Amino acid sequence: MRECISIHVGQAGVQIGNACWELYCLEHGIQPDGQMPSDKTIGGGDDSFNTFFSETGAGKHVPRAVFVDLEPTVVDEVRTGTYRQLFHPEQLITGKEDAANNYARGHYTIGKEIVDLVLDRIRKLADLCTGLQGFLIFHSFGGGTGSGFASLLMERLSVDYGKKSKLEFAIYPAPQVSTAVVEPYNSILTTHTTLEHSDCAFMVDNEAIYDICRRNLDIERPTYTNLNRLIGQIVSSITASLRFDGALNVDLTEFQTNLVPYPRIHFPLATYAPVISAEKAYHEQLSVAEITNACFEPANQMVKCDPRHGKYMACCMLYRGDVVPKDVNAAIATIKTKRTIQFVDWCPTGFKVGINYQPPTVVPGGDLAKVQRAVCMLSNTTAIAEAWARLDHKFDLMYAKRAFVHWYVGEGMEEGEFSEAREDLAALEKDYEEVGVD
Amino acid sequence: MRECISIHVGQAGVQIGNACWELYCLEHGIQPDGQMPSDKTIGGGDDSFNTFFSETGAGKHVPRAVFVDLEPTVVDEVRTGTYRQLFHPEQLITGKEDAANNYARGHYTIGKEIVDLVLDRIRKLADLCTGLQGFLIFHSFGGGTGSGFASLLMERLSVDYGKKSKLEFAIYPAPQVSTAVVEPYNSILTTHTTLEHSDCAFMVDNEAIYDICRRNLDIERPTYTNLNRLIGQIVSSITASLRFDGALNVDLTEFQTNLVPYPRIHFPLATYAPVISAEKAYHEQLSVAEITNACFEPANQMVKCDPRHGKYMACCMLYRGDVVPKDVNAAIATIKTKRTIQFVDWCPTGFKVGINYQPPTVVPGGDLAKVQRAVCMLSNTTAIAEAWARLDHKFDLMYAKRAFVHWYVGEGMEEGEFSEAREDLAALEKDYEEVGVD
Amino acid sequence: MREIVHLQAGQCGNQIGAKFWEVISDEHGIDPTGTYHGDSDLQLERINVYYNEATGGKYVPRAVLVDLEPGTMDSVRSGPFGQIFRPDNFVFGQSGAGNNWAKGHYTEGAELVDSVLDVVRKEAESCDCLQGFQLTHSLGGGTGSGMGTLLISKIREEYPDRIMNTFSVVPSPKVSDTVVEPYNATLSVHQLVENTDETYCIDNEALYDICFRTLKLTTPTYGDLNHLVSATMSGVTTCLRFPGQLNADLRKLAVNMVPFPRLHFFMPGFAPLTSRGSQQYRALTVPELTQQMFDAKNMMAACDPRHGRYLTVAAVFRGRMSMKEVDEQMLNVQNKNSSYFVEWIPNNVKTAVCDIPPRGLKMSATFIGNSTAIQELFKRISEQFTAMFRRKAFLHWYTGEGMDEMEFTEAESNMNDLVSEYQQYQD
Amino acid sequence: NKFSRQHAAFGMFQSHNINVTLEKSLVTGPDNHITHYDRLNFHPSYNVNRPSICD
Numbered sequence A, B: 001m002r003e004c005i006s007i008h009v010g011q012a013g014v015q016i017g018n019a020c021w022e023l024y025c026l027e028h029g030i031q032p033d034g035q036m037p038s039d040k041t042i043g044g045g046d047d048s049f050n051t052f053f054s055e056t057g058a059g060k061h062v063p064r065a066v067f068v069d070l071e072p073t074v075v076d077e078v079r080t081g082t083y084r085q086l087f088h089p090e091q092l093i094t095g096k097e098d099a100a101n102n103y104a105r106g107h108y109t110i111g112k113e114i115v116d117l118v119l120d121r122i123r124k125l126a127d128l129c130t131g132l133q134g135f136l137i138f139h140s141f142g143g144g145t146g147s148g149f150a151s152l153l154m155e156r157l158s159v160d161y162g163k164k165s166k167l168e169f170a171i172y173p174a175p176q177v178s179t180a181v182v183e184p185y186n187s188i189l190t191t192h193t194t195l196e197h198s199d200c201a202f203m204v205d206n207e208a209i210y211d212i213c214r215r216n217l218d219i220e221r222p223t224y225t226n227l228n229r230l231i232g233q234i235v236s237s238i239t240a241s242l243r244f245d246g247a248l249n250v251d252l253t254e255f256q257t258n259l260v261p262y263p264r265i266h267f268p269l270a271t272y273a274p275v276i277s278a279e280k281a282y283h284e285q286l287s288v289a290e291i292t293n294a295c296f297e298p299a300n301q302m303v304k305c306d307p308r309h310g311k312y313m314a315c316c317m318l319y320r321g322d323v324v325p326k327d328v329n330a331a332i333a334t335i336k337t338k339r340t341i342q343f344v345d346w347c348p349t350g351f352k353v354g355i356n357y358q359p360p361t362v363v364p365g366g367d368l369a370k371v372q373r374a375v376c377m378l379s380n381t382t383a384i385a386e387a388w389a390r391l392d393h394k395f396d397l398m399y400a401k402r403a404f405v406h407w408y409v410g411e412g413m414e415e416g417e418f419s420e421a422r423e424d425l426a427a428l429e430k431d432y433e434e435v436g437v438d
Numbered sequence C: 001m002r003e004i005v006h007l008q009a010g011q012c013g014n015q016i017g018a019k020f021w022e023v024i025s026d027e028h029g030i031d032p033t034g035t036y037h038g039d040s041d042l043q044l045e046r047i048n049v050y051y052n053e054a055t056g057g058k059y060v061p062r063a064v065l066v067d068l069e070p071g072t073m074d075s076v077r078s079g080p081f082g083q084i085f086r087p088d089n090f091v092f093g094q095s096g097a098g099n100n101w102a103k104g105h106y107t108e109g110a111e112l113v114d115s116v117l118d119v120v121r122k123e124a125e126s127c128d129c130l131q132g133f134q135l136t137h138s139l140g141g142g143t144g145s146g147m148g149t150l151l152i153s154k155i156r157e158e159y160p161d162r163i164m165n166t167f168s169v170v171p172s173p174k175v176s177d178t179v180v181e182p183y184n185a186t187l188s189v190h191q192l193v194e195n196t197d198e199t200y201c202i203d204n205e206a207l208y209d210i211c212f213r214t215l216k217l218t219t220p221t222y223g224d225l226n227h228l229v230s231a232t233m234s235g236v237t238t239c240l241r242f243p244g245q246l247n248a249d250l251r252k253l254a255v256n257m258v259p260f261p262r263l264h265f266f267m268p269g270f271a272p273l274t275s276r277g278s279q280q281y282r283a284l285t286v287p288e289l290t291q292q293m294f295d296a297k298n299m300m301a302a303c304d305p306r307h308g309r310y311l312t313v314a315a316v317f318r319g320r321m322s323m324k325e326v327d328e329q330m331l332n333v334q335n336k337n338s339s340y341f342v343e344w345i346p347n348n349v350k351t352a353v354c355d356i357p358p359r360g361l362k363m364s365a366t367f368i369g370n371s372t373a374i375q376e377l378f379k380r381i382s383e384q385f386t387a388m389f390r391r392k393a394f395l396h397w398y399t400g401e402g403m404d405e406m407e408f409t410e411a412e413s414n415m416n417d418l419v420s421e422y423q424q425y426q427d
Numbered sequence D: 001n002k003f004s005r006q007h008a009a010f011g012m013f014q015s016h017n018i019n020v021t022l023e024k025s026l027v028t029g030p031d032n033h034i035t036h037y038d039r040l041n042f043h044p045s046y047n048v049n050r051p052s053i054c055d
């Protein structure tokens, strides 16, 4: 039927799994035990949860996600946390040794002996499910364990299964913040390995998530959970099409086809418009028209790009809640007539609309707004080459002065793979400009 | 439809905004919370408030005004006041640094970085409304913050929005009382800057307001609370045509067309006849005759201008309450027969009548009278040139010995702009007598 | 699971390790006798990184004590926590040290290395998988330098896959007491550079200046200095034992501090240090801590890197704080002094946040420094070495044990190589 | 003179410290942050007709 499997890699990938799964359990009314009240929704496991959770004859929900990491610390505390009784013990794949930010350490040293184990999980996950549309991969480019280990498995998931989709999401390297100066090295090591297999990559950046937060959420001191609630809300919206229905129902396959123009580049940008504090929405009103402009205001994008320096290619809006096509179609009719918005003239149409009637609910103990008209704005533009342009100069210097390799060549690599990825990147910008060249 | 936006610039011009909004919610019966009783008036925001407030589906009436300020003290205390929950936080534009009465400091130093946010505010108010007849600007000539900041925004809103009306309301400087000696400096500066853009500016003086109160209202110790309610009533009367109806309905556009004779000079004087104490009204009677005589009594004006030294050009009477045309037209005809009243022979007719059936009410815990027949007397005469005649000999002495110039030139200014004001004023008076010259 | 076994060497390391372990014991809530009083579940869980389990809930320290002089060990044994230590690891020699570097490196160690090798390998098999080892000793110390240089060499080949954490104190530059200490230091550092991977440099004069500066109590004990330095050593080790949104592994750290192999000298940095009345005169907020932790006066290792520039900086933050303040503080300090960093590497800051506050304060941090301030250090010892080797003073002893001057010549060249090795990279 | 010497002990305070500092904004709003420079740093409100930087 209409279901998928989720993958969370790295301690950067696991808390968001905790947070998002903490979110999904709410709208379904999932109790910490796993069972509903005396009210009847249990059976062979076919209801609201059947796409996310596996509430079999035992009567309690089994989320269809696997948490994989290389350190037992953060996985044990959640194994001793709140929802551990739902969660499957060895679906919480732990590790005893770390890759130490090294892509190849998590790609050669320990990955070999542990991917077979996670291969056992996925097939025992795959056999039980029926529809198996795709995989929800959450990771990080600057992954101490997220980078290397994910790259190997997606290769093995690519080679064994090339007929279904795979959905990757990673925090993008911060444009001017670097908590690691080997975060650069592994980044294009990951991307050059993933360009030839990945289907569609969605990225976010923490700083502008914060920049929004202390702009309109009014919180100068957010918590690390708030970021996770925001991004957890983001995926909740994109999965709301899966869960519920609306005026039209759209699937990840359509998003795959209609967004990415050509091979290689598959890197669009998401954005959620109704991000505001409760007291602000308290005495103000929201409708589709103004939030449509709001998601089109550049400072509301969580990626440090000036769209005026680029050109628009694709855009996707998912209207979750009470909306009607009338004001929607007129409003989007206006945005096409706008002149500052510079789409490429190749595509007269570049928009994908998704209508869902369900109003997005508030998380208990939350900080978000009270939204009945919501949208996550998936879009891809040509203003993204600067980020890789921002990168390559950070790299050409360091590789030239040839830093940290004694760590890398010390545990067994050579410089050829570091070389190949640079023209792989150099292919990207020349690709990115030539598609920008009309 | 039929609506306008209010602007209150200056910590002087904010408590007057506090009173009028407080007054307005009364005749509408707006609870301080922002919701009506169980009576059904809420909706998409379309009723008596739709011209004034914005009571959308949220059910909270939102005043259509922006409170810009440069010192956080007064703006925060009202933000801790009674109706602060009604008020929108960032239309109470709080302030951080002061212009120190320096028009130029407010016009240049801080005004640049704030106007965009105000420009951000005004377009959001301009975009939501439909009729947008004009703007209600509350300011002051001798504004420590009112002077400089009003001038910059009106310049900016003139260049982008020049098709709607601009209603200006400022305290006229006290001819013999000077709370600041820099006050004449900026006051003429505003006039020469505002001569070429402002649409309709209405002035008033507090001393004569104080003169009135212990004459007929019989209070030797009033307060701003007493002062602001008087002007707050005044704008309430002129806006009563906007809310209520009558025998005929008139609008600011008719006011613009019919009051100002010629370009440049657009400076009429307002008056309200049935100013009287409650007990004096108690055992006496009001009718159109005596109030017509009262409104044309020279000492009933709030400006130190004696009509028999000048000549009338424009006059308008706005009857709010239970009045018949029979006694009015006969009375004004007898007024036309009057010989002391010396209108300019250029205009055979110079009166604009406004009839409204709604009786003006009293304010709870107030000091006004209980009036059935009221009139706002906005008129114009040539007896005003002496007011600018007073200012020039006030200024010309100061400029010749160039006192306090080191402050202004110290922060980056010169004498040419000060020079331009004097012939702009000299042009202003020389126009005054030639139109007076028949 | 990955654990650590400690080595206690030199007559300072005896003093150091004694304070080092008791601070840990008082932190984790075990009484001096050893019967743990259950108070925190997390420290109940992740104490196995350092201690093993004995009978009746006794947490046996996995540290090895080595010396030659019983009285120091007798004082250590009679200490408030000597009972938590075992007679097993009490290994020593029958000889008076004299603290000749040569006797401890060639004569006395010869019959002592075998036993201590047998010792350390028994506790090595006692636990499963190490991160590595750490050593407290002195570079100018007499007896510790001889034993350490011997053992670090042997542990290199037999486990070449772990951390060679060395923790040595630099003697006072103004006075070394031991006149032959410059010989001892120059000998020691030669084999230190290739064998070790990590080294902390500590100096008493700066520590004395700390009492001059913020302790403000005129006459402390050297144990008080031990208390201060143990807190710094404990602070960096709080990473591994405690949970939180920080990466603790020294490998996760060392690859981030070390650009090139010759880098092993690292300079500590600590967080709020407070005077008599300023405990209740301080508004504990991150900006003041970041100001305080980045104070040249707060520095305690060698000297002020003001004369040089900053290669790599890494600071671990302990307490209930958040990533935004460190981020905005990092932007501030980056924009504050970008020029005083090296254009060689930007973003040379590596931040870690420990959510578990210490016992006694909530907001704290530890910093480790890699700058160009060590030139003054080994340049100082260079003139000492050249002057004392100019006329071969105090040499007839060292020739007696069978040592020759060619060792000194090629050793000094190694330090002279590091002089250019530091200078060329920055200057 | 008890407080004096117990204060006058040792040396007297002197700034060899790292001159760290954060430039603040000209607004009290915990959301808007604009200085002499970077005056376009604030939350953009939500316009309904004209999109961002229409002109």
Ligand SMILES: Nc1nc2c(ncn2[C@@H]2O[C@H](COP(=O)(O)OP(=O)(O)OP(=O)(O)O)[C@@H](O)[C@H]2O)c(=O)[nH]1
Pocket: A009, A010, A011, A012, A013, A014, A015, A016, A071, A098, A100, A101, A139, A140, A142, A143, A144, A145, A146, A147, A170, A171, A179, C245, C247, C252
């Ligand atoms: N996506 C995501 N990123 C996080 C989260 N928490 C922190 N981060 C950021 O993501 C980075 C994590 O990258 P890595 O350090 O390589 O993580 P790892 O590969 O799983 O292994 P470690 O280095 O041991 O943590 C950190 O530097 C954080 O800035 C999170 O919960 N989710």
Ligand SMILES: Nc1nc2c(ncn2[C@@H]2O[C@H](COP(=O)(O)OP(=O)(O)OP(=O)(O)O)[C@@H](O)[C@H]2O)c(=O)[nH]1
Pocket: B009, B010, B011, B012, B013, B014, B015, B016, B071, B101, B140, B142, B143, B144, B145, B146, B147, B171, B179, B180, B224
């Ligand atoms: N509009 C108004 N004016 C007042 C009030 N009370 C006194 N005034 C007069 O209005 C003038 C205020 O002008 P400014 O001092 O320039 O006001 P500002 O520019 O907003 O800044 P401040 O100097 O802080 O008041 C004073 O000189 C008073 O004579 C009041 O309640 N409302």
Ligand SMILES: Nc1nc2c(ncn2[C@@H]2O[C@H](COP(=O)(O)OP(=O)(O)OP(=O)(O)O)[C@@H](O)[C@H]2O)c(=O)[nH]1
Pocket: C009, C010, C011, C012, C013, C015, C097, C098, C099, C100, C137, C138, C140, C141, C142, C143, C144, C145, C177, C178, C222
């Ligand atoms: N324990 C201790 N050692 C100190 C102190 N101050 C300086 N030191 C020096 O720290 C050095 C390290 O101790 P060890 O390495 O054990 O010294 P050693 O090998 O026994 O040899 P000697 O220095 O000749 O006594 C010693 O050499 C002392 O000179 C102090 O206050 N306490």
